[PDB]
């Protein structure tokens, strides 16, 4: 079907983010590939402006849910692939409990044969000595569920979830995520019933890379519709 046929193989990915958090500006480029048949992503991100002024884990969710594995019985409800190749706009607010928030606007679409995620991120109201700008968050990542609902009015979807970032003192920082996705163009989309994505993410470093960077391996599987 439309869009999902573009994901049967391994697809190259490009990620590009312009960020400004509390006035601290940065840019990040990423490259890698996705194999939606297995829900599999492999990505490497490089901060092209120097040192990243926020913890890498805080950007994971912002840096391509069209690569989720939708089981065959759920494929009528895979919005993200259905919008391709024209794509979708993905907007989020990420509210760090007792700290500031990120607002992200992204366009996810094909440019030629490459799946691109172009993002602008703005962060406001952060504590300069908080867990984010104080770099108190551990370089690790928990497994989470992403809860998806249809947005009939906008012909798209919403999602809600709460990321839990381990802090170096053995506590956890909550990062509430509010998400809205809108298809690009007048084409057909598959609006889903309520369901979720089960997401596991592993963060590492490239031993040969001297720039500030993050390697991400992620598995995402849709679930919650069966009966
Ligand atoms: Cl970090
Ligand atoms: Cl969760």
GROMACS .gro file of C-alpha atoms and ligand atoms in nm:
model
  229
    1UNK     CA    1   0.000   0.000   0.000
    2UNK     CA    2   0.097   0.368  -0.025
    3UNK     CA    3   0.401   0.460   0.177
    4UNK     CA    4   0.445   0.127   0.354
    5UNK     CA    5   0.579  -0.023   0.029
    6UNK     CA    6   0.878   0.216   0.062
    7UNK     CA    7   0.987   0.051   0.389
    8UNK     CA    8   1.013  -0.317   0.298
    9UNK     CA    9   1.393  -0.291   0.273
   10UNK     CA   10   1.670  -0.097   0.447
   11UNK     CA   11   1.616   0.277   0.402
   12UNK     CA   12   1.890   0.545   0.449
   13UNK     CA   13   1.805   0.815   0.702
   14UNK     CA   14   1.922   1.174   0.747
   15UNK     CA   15   1.844   1.376   1.059
   16UNK     CA   16   1.913   1.750   1.084
   17UNK     CA   17   1.835   1.955   1.395
   18UNK     CA   18   1.874   2.326   1.472
   19UNK     CA   19   1.843   2.384   1.845
   20UNK     CA   20   1.836   2.675   2.087
   21UNK     CA   21   1.789   2.596   2.455
   22UNK     CA   22   1.803   2.888   2.700
   23UNK     CA   23   1.993   3.082   2.428
   24UNK     CA   24   2.250   2.807   2.391
   25UNK     CA   25   2.244   2.728   2.019
   26UNK     CA   26   2.356   2.403   1.858
   27UNK     CA   27   2.317   2.198   1.543
   28UNK     CA   28   2.318   1.822   1.504
   29UNK     CA   29   2.345   1.605   1.193
   30UNK     CA   30   2.262   1.235   1.191
   31UNK     CA   31   2.298   0.947   0.948
   32UNK     CA   32   2.199   0.585   0.955
   33UNK     CA   33   1.939   0.344   0.833
   34UNK     CA   34   1.608   0.192   0.923
   35UNK     CA   35   1.466  -0.159   0.867
   36UNK     CA   36   1.099  -0.124   0.955
   37UNK     CA   37   1.040  -0.494   0.889
   38UNK     CA   38   1.221  -0.549   1.222
   39UNK     CA   39   1.134  -0.214   1.381
   40UNK     CA   40   1.508  -0.147   1.373
   41UNK     CA   41   1.696   0.186   1.365
   42UNK     CA   42   2.073   0.248   1.368
   43UNK     CA   43   2.174   0.617   1.383
   44UNK     CA   44   2.482   0.825   1.461
   45UNK     CA   45   2.439   1.194   1.554
   46UNK     CA   46   2.717   1.454   1.553
   47UNK     CA   47   2.703   1.797   1.716
   48UNK     CA   48   2.843   2.017   1.440
   49UNK     CA   49   2.869   2.330   1.654
   50UNK     CA   50   3.103   2.193   1.924
   51UNK     CA   51   2.989   2.049   2.252
   52UNK     CA   52   2.619   1.973   2.284
   53UNK     CA   53   2.486   2.205   2.562
   54UNK     CA   54   2.215   1.958   2.669
   55UNK     CA   55   2.245   1.586   2.751
   56UNK     CA   56   2.229   1.363   2.441
   57UNK     CA   57   1.954   1.143   2.592
   58UNK     CA   58   1.717   1.444   2.605
   59UNK     CA   59   1.720   1.460   2.221
   60UNK     CA   60   1.661   1.088   2.145
   61UNK     CA   61   1.285   1.115   2.096
   62UNK     CA   62   1.324   1.424   1.876
   63UNK     CA   63   1.586   1.270   1.648
   64UNK     CA   64   1.112   0.859   1.258
   65UNK     CA   65   0.819   0.646   1.370
   66UNK     CA   66   0.760   0.528   1.014
   67UNK     CA   67   1.032   0.272   1.104
   68UNK     CA   68   0.817   0.107   1.371
   69UNK     CA   69   0.729  -0.256   1.314
   70UNK     CA   70   0.353  -0.281   1.270
   71UNK     CA   71   0.244  -0.647   1.287
   72UNK     CA   72   0.048  -0.752   0.982
   73UNK     CA   73  -0.279  -0.753   1.173
   74UNK     CA   74  -0.219  -0.386   1.262
   75UNK     CA   75  -0.112  -0.256   0.922
   76UNK     CA   76  -0.442  -0.076   0.856
   77UNK     CA   77  -0.349   0.150   1.141
   78UNK     CA   78   0.008   0.252   1.044
   79UNK     CA   79  -0.035   0.623   0.997
   80UNK     CA   80   0.334   0.705   0.980
   81UNK     CA   81   0.413   0.496   0.672
   82UNK     CA   82   0.082   0.579   0.505
   83UNK     CA   83   0.171   0.949   0.478
   84UNK     CA   84   0.492   0.873   0.283
   85UNK     CA   85   0.655   0.975   0.061
   86UNK     CA   86   0.506   1.325   0.104
   87UNK     CA   87   0.543   1.281   0.478
   88UNK     CA   88   0.411   1.442   0.790
   89UNK     CA   89   0.481   1.725   1.029
   90UNK     CA   90   0.558   1.611   1.383
   91UNK     CA   91   0.531   1.864   1.665
   92UNK     CA   92   0.601   1.804   2.030
   93UNK     CA   93   0.627   1.973   2.362
   94UNK     CA   94   0.865   1.793   2.599
   95UNK     CA   95   0.806   1.924   2.955
   96UNK     CA   96   1.086   1.842   3.196
   97UNK     CA   97   0.927   1.820   3.543
   98UNK     CA   98   1.033   2.120   3.757
   99UNK     CA   99   1.245   2.253   3.471
  100UNK     CA  100   1.206   2.396   3.123
  101UNK     CA  101   1.048   2.260   2.807
  102UNK     CA  102   1.146   2.182   2.451
  103UNK     CA  103   0.910   2.257   2.162
  104UNK     CA  104   1.000   2.076   1.843
  105UNK     CA  105   0.869   2.109   1.487
  106UNK     CA  106   0.985   1.846   1.241
  107UNK     CA  107   0.914   1.746   0.887
  108UNK     CA  108   0.959   1.375   0.810
  109UNK     CA  109   0.951   1.290   0.441
  110UNK     CA  110   1.152   1.135   0.160
  111UNK     CA  111   1.410   1.343  -0.025
  112UNK     CA  112   1.478   1.111  -0.319
  113UNK     CA  113   1.541   0.769  -0.169
  114UNK     CA  114   1.637   0.900   0.177
  115UNK     CA  115   1.402   0.937   0.471
  116UNK     CA  116   1.474   1.279   0.623
  117UNK     CA  117   1.382   1.420   0.962
  118UNK     CA  118   1.437   1.802   0.962
  119UNK     CA  119   1.382   1.955   1.307
  120UNK     CA  120   1.372   2.294   1.478
  121UNK     CA  121   1.391   2.279   1.858
  122UNK     CA  122   1.337   2.568   2.102
  123UNK     CA  123   1.397   2.529   2.475
  124UNK     CA  124   1.272   2.790   2.725
  125UNK     CA  125   1.256   2.834   3.103
  126UNK     CA  126   1.538   2.595   3.195
  127UNK     CA  127   1.725   2.612   3.521
  128UNK     CA  128   2.092   2.678   3.439
  129UNK     CA  129   2.182   2.443   3.728
  130UNK     CA  130   1.907   2.191   3.667
  131UNK     CA  131   1.938   1.833   3.549
  132UNK     CA  132   1.940   1.934   3.181
  133UNK     CA  133   2.175   2.230   3.155
  134UNK     CA  134   2.375   2.103   3.455
  135UNK     CA  135   2.445   1.781   3.257
  136UNK     CA  136   2.321   1.561   3.544
  137UNK     CA  137   2.154   1.301   3.327
  138UNK     CA  138   2.320   0.962   3.278
  139UNK     CA  139   2.413   0.852   2.926
  140UNK     CA  140   2.155   0.570   2.915
  141UNK     CA  141   1.794   0.513   2.817
  142UNK     CA  142   1.489   0.331   2.950
  143UNK     CA  143   1.224   0.138   2.760
  144UNK     CA  144   0.894   0.324   2.713
  145UNK     CA  145   0.549   0.295   2.557
  146UNK     CA  146   0.428   0.564   2.314
  147UNK     CA  147   0.046   0.589   2.335
  148UNK     CA  148  -0.111   0.682   1.999
  149UNK     CA  149  -0.462   0.811   1.927
  150UNK     CA  150  -0.626   0.940   1.611
  151UNK     CA  151  -0.673   1.312   1.560
  152UNK     CA  152  -0.975   1.303   1.334
  153UNK     CA  153  -1.009   1.683   1.316
  154UNK     CA  154  -0.659   1.730   1.172
  155UNK     CA  155  -0.660   1.398   0.985
  156UNK     CA  156  -0.354   1.287   1.181
  157UNK     CA  157  -0.253   1.146   1.516
  158UNK     CA  158  -0.161   1.250   1.864
  159UNK     CA  159   0.064   1.071   2.103
  160UNK     CA  160   0.141   1.094   2.471
  161UNK     CA  161   0.413   0.935   2.678
  162UNK     CA  162   0.651   1.018   2.958
  163UNK     CA  163   1.024   0.965   2.919
  164UNK     CA  164   1.218   0.875   3.232
  165UNK     CA  165   1.579   0.996   3.227
  166UNK     CA  166   1.805   0.853   3.498
  167UNK     CA  167   1.990   1.125   3.692
  168UNK     CA  168   2.346   1.073   3.824
  169UNK     CA  169   2.227   1.084   4.185
  170UNK     CA  170   2.005   0.778   4.144
  171UNK     CA  171   1.683   0.969   4.088
  172UNK     CA  172   1.486   0.999   3.762
  173UNK     CA  173   1.387   1.309   3.566
  174UNK     CA  174   1.040   1.294   3.406
  175UNK     CA  175   0.998   1.434   3.055
  176UNK     CA  176   0.630   1.445   2.959
  177UNK     CA  177   0.584   1.427   2.580
  178UNK     CA  178   0.284   1.573   2.396
  179UNK     CA  179   0.288   1.500   2.024
  180UNK     CA  180   0.080   1.593   1.721
  181UNK     CA  181   0.136   1.468   1.368
  182UNK     CA  182  -0.029   1.613   1.056
  183UNK     CA  183   0.006   1.463   0.704
  184UNK     CA  184   0.151   1.672   0.423
  185UNK     CA  185  -0.077   1.718   0.126
  186UNK     CA  186  -0.429   1.593   0.053
  187UNK     CA  187  -0.335   1.231   0.005
  188UNK     CA  188  -0.478   0.929   0.185
  189UNK     CA  189  -0.372   0.835   0.537
  190UNK     CA  190  -0.450   0.550   0.774
  191UNK     CA  191  -0.590   0.688   1.096
  192UNK     CA  192  -0.534   0.437   1.377
  193UNK     CA  193  -0.734   0.299   1.662
  194UNK     CA  194  -0.575   0.356   2.004
  195UNK     CA  195  -0.256   0.154   2.036
  196UNK     CA  196   0.101   0.194   2.151
  197UNK     CA  197   0.462   0.160   2.037
  198UNK     CA  198   0.702  -0.034   2.264
  199UNK     CA  199   1.041   0.134   2.232
  200UNK     CA  200   1.383   0.016   2.344
  201UNK     CA  201   1.689   0.235   2.292
  202UNK     CA  202   2.058   0.174   2.351
  203UNK     CA  203   2.308   0.462   2.350
  204UNK     CA  204   2.679   0.420   2.277
  205UNK     CA  205   2.983   0.600   2.135
  206UNK     CA  206   3.182   0.551   1.812
  207UNK     CA  207   3.534   0.471   1.937
  208UNK     CA  208   3.684   0.655   1.639
  209UNK     CA  209   3.482   0.974   1.673
  210UNK     CA  210   3.636   1.279   1.839
  211UNK     CA  211   3.343   1.513   1.789
  212UNK     CA  212   3.064   1.518   2.045
  213UNK     CA  213   2.820   1.253   1.923
  214UNK     CA  214   2.572   0.978   2.004
  215UNK     CA  215   2.518   0.630   1.854
  216UNK     CA  216   2.162   0.504   1.889
  217UNK     CA  217   2.025   0.153   1.834
  218UNK     CA  218   1.651   0.140   1.872
  219UNK     CA  219   1.373  -0.121   1.831
  220UNK     CA  220   1.011  -0.009   1.805
  221UNK     CA  221   0.716  -0.248   1.784
  222UNK     CA  222   0.349  -0.152   1.759
  223UNK     CA  223   0.114  -0.340   1.987
  224UNK     CA  224  -0.221  -0.320   2.148
  225UNK     CA  225  -0.455  -0.414   1.865
  226UNK     CA  226  -0.535  -0.784   1.820
  227UNK     CA  227  -0.897  -0.874   1.884
  228LIG    CL1  228   2.515   1.340   2.716
  229LIG    CL1  229   0.634   0.401   2.971
   0.00000   0.00000   0.00000
